[PDB]
Amino acid sequence: GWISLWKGFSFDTRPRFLWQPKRECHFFNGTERVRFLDRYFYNQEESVRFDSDVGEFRAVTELGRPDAEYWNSQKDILEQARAAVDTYCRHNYGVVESFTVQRRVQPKVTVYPSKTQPLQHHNLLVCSVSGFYPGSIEVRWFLNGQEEKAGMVSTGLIQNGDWTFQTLVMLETVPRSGEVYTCQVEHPSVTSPLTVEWRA
């Protein structure tokens, strides 16, 4: 299919002036509930906005006040915006859905000891989860069937910018012989949880 753009409407120390249109389509439960926003930003400051849940243009700052009023008086401009949820959002959703909403890339999970600082014996177990999509993920540490919930630091979700994610979850522990640690990963690319064991 052909992605259709939203055309929108018409209104070194030297100074810069920046114009930022943002056309947002918010989807809930597929295209069951869709929300469209036409947002115009001047020097990072929103001036005028069309929100499909409101049904008319609104000035966010005084700078956008003339255009919100004029656009709201135009039957044709206003009905174009109110139709955008269909002519624009739902259209583009059907075009890109197969390789965006449905994209699934499996994580690579590895476990390795590390150190908080120059120490003599490893005091961190690192569960490295990388290369996955989408970003929704759960990473849990277990020590012999008991979930370790204390003494954990995570990098959080790291977006690599190439449609893959990465995350590291560190367990603060000096491993003792006979202890079996399990990192458990839940991700929509796999039906069951992923587990990776590490022994001292």
């Binding site: 929108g8 018409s10 810069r16 920046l18 114009w19 700078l63 390789f99 990388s130 977006q159 910018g161």
Partner: protein
């Protein structure tokens, strides 16, 4: 729950403009203004969809005309520089002599003008490097990624050097094997 964003900008006096689609924070495509060309973020995307880059060129023209109207209306109020914060990380856990990728993540900045150089042992590198366009944020600052494929070793150290008008000095973020 998903969000698709058509994000554009035009910047004076640089006369820079960009046009891109964002899906849940990742780029679907942008339009190469010089080459009149749709550039998909992953090559496979272009085998499932199409976009007329001419339409993006037309939107940029309207953006320029809108900018000049609003610049005058604001009595030429300029934008406040916001300097980036820079993070250098690897694509995956680093293993010696096993190919990896250095990522320079440039975040939370505006206007969308930046100079980025990869340095290996203090020397600028340009071989195999790649970059993204200026990506949107919810707070309407920008993101950008720069990439450098590398062979990890104990001998080479790396820096991503970032210059921005909101910074007093070049920002260098270091990376080395530990």
């Amino acid at each position: 729950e998903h969000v698709i964003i058509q994000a554009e900008f035009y910047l004076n006096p640089d006369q820079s403009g960009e046009f891109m689609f964002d899906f849940d924070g990742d780029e679907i495509f942008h339009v190469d203004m010089a080459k009149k060309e749709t550039v998909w973020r992953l090559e496979e995307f272009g085998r499932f969809a199409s976009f007329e880059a001419q339409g993006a060129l037309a939107n940029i023209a309207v953006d320029k005309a809108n900018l000049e109207i609003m610049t005058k209306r604001s009595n030429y109020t300029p934008i406040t520089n916001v300097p980036p914060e820079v993070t250098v990380l690897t694509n995956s856990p680093v293993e010696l002599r096993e190919p990896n990728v250095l990522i320079c993540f440039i975040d939370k900045f505006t206007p969308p003008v930046v100079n980025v150089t990869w340095l290996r042992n203090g020397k600028p590198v340009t071989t195999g490097v790649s970059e993204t366009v200026f990506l949107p944020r919810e707070d309407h600052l920008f993101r950008k990624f720069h990439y450098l494929p590398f062979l990890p070793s104990t001998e080479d150290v790396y820096d991503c050097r970032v210059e921005h008008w909101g910074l007093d000095e070049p920002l260098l973020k270091h990376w080395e094997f530990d």
